């Protein structure tokens, strides 16, 4: 259409607030203070196309997954209300995290204010994803051990809330603090070792490894570290600046890792639910 006509612009002519990655040389969206232009750009080819769709498609998937999970027969669960509320808080975190991100990337070029407000929701989004992922996992791991289940939930809440407070800070969004962000969110997810070690100390090596806690956790931690390293080190556009502007840049690859990582986590924690079903409720 002949309304809100725009063109992809080189990195150099971007305002300071829109200059995030110096390695993405071309294909940027010019600052357009119209949500109309912003939401149509979802159907255009630019630096954020991949970013929008990865978490736009992932968002509907987790929503349908969340919907279907809730409608699961109450027969398949030992405590259908409890397990459904624990899985619910994970989907609440997954859906919110993804919805915030694809919305942020869509409305990224509106204004300095819109970017500021939406970037804050984007970072806070991830902290809700880490907090939400812990709730079902911590619940199944500390099923017949209620005191640590409760303690560890508070530490994740306080740390997650701290990560939400840290994301509000304006210096936090600067490209120099990219490393700080990567470390902050890595620390939050990597806090998984405290409950794991407690679990391993009590359940046993064989018992923790029998159940795929380790197989699943090494993979979790791998995605967590391989995933943050890409974000912080800006691979592969660090080498190859240009040619990676539209496809397969670090943010795009990282976006794929969030969707992939959240699905794999759901799969691991859905197995714990299935095992508990075979075992039944209570303890020896």
């Amino acid at each position, epitope marked *: 259409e002949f309304e*809100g006509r*725009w063109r992809v*612009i080189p990195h150099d002519v971007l305002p300071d607030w829109l200059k995030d990655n110096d390695f993405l040389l071309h294909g940027h969206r010019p*600052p357009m203070p*119209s949500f109309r232009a912003c939401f149509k750009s979802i159907f255009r080819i630019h630096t954020e196309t991949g970013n929008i769709w990865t978490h736009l498609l992932g968002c509907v998937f987790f929503l349908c997954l969340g919907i279907f999970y809730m409608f699961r027969p109450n027969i398949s669960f030992v405590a259908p209300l409890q397990e459904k509320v624990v899985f619910g808080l994970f989907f609440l975190g997954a859906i919110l995290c993804l919805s915030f991100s694809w919305l942020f990337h869509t409305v990224y070029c509106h*204004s300095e204010g819109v970017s500021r407000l939406f970037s804050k929701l984007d970072y806070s989004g991830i902290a809700l994803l880490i907090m939400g992922s812990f709730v079902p996992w911590l619940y199944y791991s500390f099923y017949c051990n209620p005191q640590p289940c409760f303690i560890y939930l508070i530490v994740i809440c306080v740390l997650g809330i701290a990560a939400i407070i840290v994301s509000q800070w304006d210096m936090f969004a600067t490209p120099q603090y990219r490393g700080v962000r990567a470390g902050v969110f890595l620390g939050l997810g990597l806090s998984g070792i405290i409950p794991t070690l407690h679990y391993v100390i009590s359940e046993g090596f064989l018992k923790a490894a029998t159940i795929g806690q380790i197989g699943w956790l090494m993979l979790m931690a791998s995605l967590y570290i391989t995933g943050a390293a890409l974000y912080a080190a800006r691979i592969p556009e660090r080498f190859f600046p240009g040619k990676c502007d539209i496809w397969f840049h670090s943010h795009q690859l990282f976006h794929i890792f969030v969707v992939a990582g959240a699905f794999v986590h759901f799969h691991g924690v859905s197995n714990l639910q299935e095992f508990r079903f075979m075992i039944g409720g209570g303890c020896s």
Partner: single-chain antibody
Amino acid sequence: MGEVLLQQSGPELVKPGASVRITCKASGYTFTDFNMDWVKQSPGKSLEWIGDFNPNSGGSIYNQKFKDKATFTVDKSSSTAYMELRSLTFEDTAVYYCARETGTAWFAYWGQGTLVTVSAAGGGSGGGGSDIQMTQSPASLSASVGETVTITCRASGNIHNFLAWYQQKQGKSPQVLVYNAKTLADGVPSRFSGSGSGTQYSLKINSLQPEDFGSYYCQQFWSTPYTFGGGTKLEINA
């Protein structure tokens, strides 16, 4: 290069019914990266959008006023843009500008201006008005130095904050002050402040200075054809 410069051909004095080919030499950037626009300003009158040309694609979009009168060509090799005006009449006596678009059609860089004078001293039609009407208030004002002035722009339809403010000194090309309704352009003093939403926008100059006199224009770049406001003549008594 060091600076983005748009440089056009020299003044033209033509016989009625002739044809002129105006040149715009673009330097300081990748020529193909941005659209180039052509703007006509008749003597003592506001700016009119002739059309835009995409140097990469080679695609031209024309204002229907100039659909028959103007043609856009390029030379990606010499980094020049051209505009051919044909079957020239007395009405065509105007200064024609090339203005470079950035992402959105607000003009950061302007050509010096080529004057086409149509004269039969050596031996047709009219101009309309379409789609988004830009209304500027006041048409003229005069304020003592240090005073605060507010200029408004009212669009016939919603332009979605795709509004730019220009200042024009006597016999010079307009220079952008504000783009995207509130964003302040590079080198423009903090005195200029752009505010507005929907169809009603305003420009406020605080503690006006002797350099502040000139003509102020507002441009809408939401819909095509892009339109300019009638202008505000600002005189400084001091």
